[PDB]
Amino acid sequence: SNQNNF
Amino acid sequence: SNQNNF
Numbered sequence: 198s199n200q201n202n203f
Numbered sequence: 204s205n206q207n208n209f
Contacts, residue, residue: 200205201206201207201209202207
């Protein structure tokens with residue numbers, strides 16, 4: 198699972 | 204699993 202926090 | 208914290 199993936200999380201991108203821009 | 205991956206997390207990118209920009």
